[PDB]
Amino acid sequence: SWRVPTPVQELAAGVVEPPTQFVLQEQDRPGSGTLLFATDMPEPIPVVDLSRLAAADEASKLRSALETWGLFLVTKHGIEASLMDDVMAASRDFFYQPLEAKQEYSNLIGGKRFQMEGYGNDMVKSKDQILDWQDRLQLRVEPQDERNLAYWPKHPDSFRDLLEKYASKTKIVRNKVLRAMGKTLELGEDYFISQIGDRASAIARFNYYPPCPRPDLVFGIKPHSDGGAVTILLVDKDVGGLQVQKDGVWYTVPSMPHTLLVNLGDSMEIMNNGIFKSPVHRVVTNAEKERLSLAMFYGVEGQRVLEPALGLLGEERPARYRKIMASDYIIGLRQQRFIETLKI
């Protein structure tokens, strides 16, 4: 039974204690037993005006942010507040539907076996696995010919249209960030555009974190780094919870309305020879309100061999990561963090 979890939104309704499968060992808890989860992020806060990324001072801000945090907030990103609010409303609308309606999109293929795409939870591997306090709807967006539209919610009926339009807007953001990164690494503005390739990948993950009566005991999403090249994250109504690790310390990622958060993923850490790192991040829950986010994961095409860019290497700049085909990295990332296995 334990390999077929009931959605946390159901298990959380009205409870005053988290069920045992969500409770972390005391030393793993946010605050490690206590109620102080994270430190405020010190100034300067990493914020990048995406419309001015060709100005030298703005490019410098992007570089500083990537060296320091591996992530940054973006303003002037070209996405209407109306579209951001509507795509997150469509997500909320879906999660508020009855369990049996959402389960038509279940990622448990016969109610028993996990796959990534669909509505439900991440894979449960071992009965001792501590589960995260969240549900998610995860969908293949690109390459468009690999989509399985049977997993895309039909209600509200504008869900697909809104996701398609939003993702076309975050793809613009992806391209601007990647071009700025090729330039600052002196690899050519185009370098990462060519890396992701014609069949560049895009996955949409709608996260739903129910309120938790004991946020000191659980993770909304456990510490992790993302697997792709860059992630573009939208947090609905800027509800707090997202935290980033730097030097063993957990820092609150600040909220800014109508902004996006851009963070690097493991594929970029490999490609850029670890000059910038893929940041480890987590979500802590709260007692008062649900929290919703939409992560757009952008990665390289499946056949691309991930390796440190030749332009970053030389006699005194050895490769720090071993070569691996992108699809094999993602599979290995699924089944000690996985990117450490690639270090040489």
Ligand X SMILES: O=C(O)CCC(=O)C(=O)O
CA atoms of 145 and 199, how far apart (whole Å): 10
Among 297, 307, 324, 339, binds ligand 92L (CB under 6 A): 297
Task: Output b/e per residue, 32-60; b: 16+ Cβ within 10 A.
Answer: eeeeebbeebeeeebbbebeebeeeebbe
Figure out which of the listed residues 132, 226, 236, 290 binds Co ion, where binding follows CB under 5 A: 226
Task: Between 48 and 204, name the residue whose CB sits nearer to ligand X.
Answer: 204
Q: How many residues bind ligand 92L (CB under 6 A)?
A: 17
C-beta of 8 vs 300, nearer to ligand 92L: 300
What does the alpha-carbon distance between residue 193 and residue 206 come to, in Å, rounded to a whole number? 26
Residue window 186-225: x/- pattern of binding to ligand X, with contact defined by CB under 6 A: -------------------x-x-------------x----
How many CA atoms are closer than 13 Å to the CA of 265, on its beta-carbon side?
25
Do the annotations mark residue 209 as ligand-binding? yes
Q: How many CA atoms, within 13 angstroms, populate the side-chain half-sphere of residue 75?
A: 11
Among 37, 276, 298, 321, which residue interacts with ligand 92L (rule: CB under 6 A)?
Answer: 298
Residue written as token pair 């391209």: 175
Residues numbered 42-101 forming contacts with ligand X, rule: CB under 6 A: none
- Which positions from 120 to 159 touch ligand X by CB under 6 A, shown as an x/- string? ----------------------------------------
Q: What is the four-CA torsion angle of 299, 303, 305, 309, rounded to 10 degrees? A: -50
Helical (H) or strand (E) element with 120: strand 118-120
90 binds ligand 92L (CB under 6 A): no
Quick one: 187 or 330, whose CB is closer to ligand X? 330
For position 295 contacting ligand X by CB under 6 A, the verdict is: yes
Residues 218-277 contacting ligand X, CB under 6 A: 221, 226, 233, 235, 242
Q: What are phi and psi of 281, to 5 degrees?
A: -145, 165
308 in Cβ contact with 270 (< 8 Å): yes
Residue written as tokens 């909220």?
A: 255
Q: Binding residue for ligand X (CB under 6 A) from 140, 176, 281, 304?
A: 281
Q: Is 293 in the site for ligand X (CB under 6 A)?
A: yes
With both helix axes pointing from N to C terminus, report the angle between 159-184 and 56-68 in degrees, rounded to the nearest 10: 100
Residue 197 makes contact with ligand 92L by CB under 6 A = no
List residues binding ligand X (CB under 6 A).
205, 207, 221, 226, 233, 235, 242, 281, 283, 293, 295
